[PDB]
Amino acid sequence: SYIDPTQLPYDHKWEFPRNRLSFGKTLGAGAFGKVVEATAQGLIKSDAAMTVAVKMLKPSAHSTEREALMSELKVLSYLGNHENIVNLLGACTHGGPTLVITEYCCYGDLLNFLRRKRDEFVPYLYKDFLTLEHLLSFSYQVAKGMAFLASKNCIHRDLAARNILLTHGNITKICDFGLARDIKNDSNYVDKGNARLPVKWMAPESIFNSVYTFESDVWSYGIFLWELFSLGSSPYPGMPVDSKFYKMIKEGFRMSSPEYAPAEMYDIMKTCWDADPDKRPTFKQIVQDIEKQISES
Numbered sequence: 616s617y618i619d620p621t622q623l624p625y626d627h628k629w630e631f632p633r634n635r636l637s638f639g640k641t642l643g644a645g646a647f648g649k650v651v652e653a654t655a656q657g658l659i660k661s662d663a664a665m666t667v668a669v670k671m672l673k674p675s676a677h678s679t680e681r682e683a684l685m686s687e688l689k690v691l692s693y694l695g696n697h698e699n700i701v702n703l704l705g706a707c708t709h710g711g712p713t714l715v716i717t718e719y720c721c722y723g724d725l726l727n728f729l730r731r732k733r734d735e736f737v738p739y740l741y742k743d744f745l746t747l748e749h750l751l752s753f754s755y756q757v758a759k760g761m762a763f764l765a766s767k768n769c770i771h772r773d774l775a776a777r778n779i780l781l782t783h784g785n786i787t788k789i790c791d792f793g794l795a796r797d798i799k800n801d802s803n804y805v806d807k808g809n810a811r812l813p814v815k816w817m818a819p820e821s822i823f824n825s826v827y828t829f830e831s832d833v834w835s836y837g838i839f840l841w842e843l844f845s846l847g848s849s850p851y852p853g854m855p856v857d858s859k860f861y862k863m864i865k866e867g868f869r870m871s872s873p874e875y876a877p878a879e880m881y882d883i884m885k886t887c888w889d890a891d892p893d894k895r896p897t898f899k900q901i902v903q904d905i906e907k908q909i910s911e912s
């Protein structure tokens with residue numbers, strides 16, 4: 616962390632009346648928070664309703680979780696809108712609990728989308744089959760969103776396919792479910808000290824020294840590329856997170872290329888996984904690299 620989210624300002628232009636929201640089904644829930652599908656009336660200039668996503672806390676939440684939701688709102692307001700990120704539509708900070716209104720993404724999280732599309736995947740129609748072209752586009756859009764986050768001095772800390780949403784026209788949006796994810800029952804989060812952490816996506820310096828940087832997010836992006844080109848497989852298959860796992864990461868063990876990864880995409884993964892953070896590429900360098908790969912395709 617380079618910037619203190621609590622000190623970031625919230626623009627009151629985002630303020631929306633909560634009585635103009637109609638809550639539907641829960642899209643995701645954790646121990647202290649949830650994301651609900653909702654209908655927002657008067658969000659559009661004309662008298663028309665629109666589907667939105669609303670993040671809110673559960674009655675189970677404490678002062679820490681209340682501050683974390685406000686900190687998330689300040690970060691979203693500070694960042695402003697970007698094509699490759701879930702965008703803020705509004706918020707409710709008066710007359711009740713904090714509500715954060717973000718855009719609805721019709722295809723949901725990228726991880727479940729890849730798992731659902733896995734069997735009909737075509738490397739190279741009405742069928743809407745997942746292709747290598749879509750995977751390259753997804754890699755490019757996420758690198759672009761990450762380059763923008765880096766440019767605003769923001770560290771994601773939990774970049775993974777599960778924190779990517781898919782919307783209209785195979786458009787990816789970096790998100791953070793955070794408290795609206797049941798990390799206690801998610802096998803992708805491991806007990807490490809007093810926390811439940813996504814260890815298989817974390818850079819060694821994050822694991823062993825609690826250091827989160829622009830470079831540690833780059834490491835996670837490399838893990839994300841592995842998930843993407845394996846069509847939603849869990850990283851380090853058959854390897855539990857134990858003493859042997861930590862020893863192997865420290866001693867230089869790295870995953871082999873996934874079945875559908877082009878050699879140039881696996882080259883990015885290897886550089887993302889450099890033990891030296893200074894030897895890893897920046898998100899901007901990754902964007903330029905993928906750009907070249909797409910044009911040459």
Ligand SMILES: COCCOc1cc(F)c2c(Nc3ccc(NC(=O)Cn4cc(C(C)C)nn4)cc3)ncnc2c1
Binds near residue numbers: 650
């Ligand atoms: C087949 O699928 C059917 C549709 O299913 C869904 C499921 C969902 F969970 C959805 C969803 N959830 C959601 C996830 C995260 C957040 N909040 C943030 O990301 C806030 N944020 C953003 C950041 C950084 C800038 C990256 N940090 N915090 C808000 C909402 N949203 C929209 N549409 C969804 C659609």
Ligand SMILES: [Cl-]
Binds near residue numbers: 673675
């Ligand atoms: Cl509850």
Ligand SMILES: [Cl-]
Binds near residue numbers: 681684712713
């Ligand atoms: Cl609250």
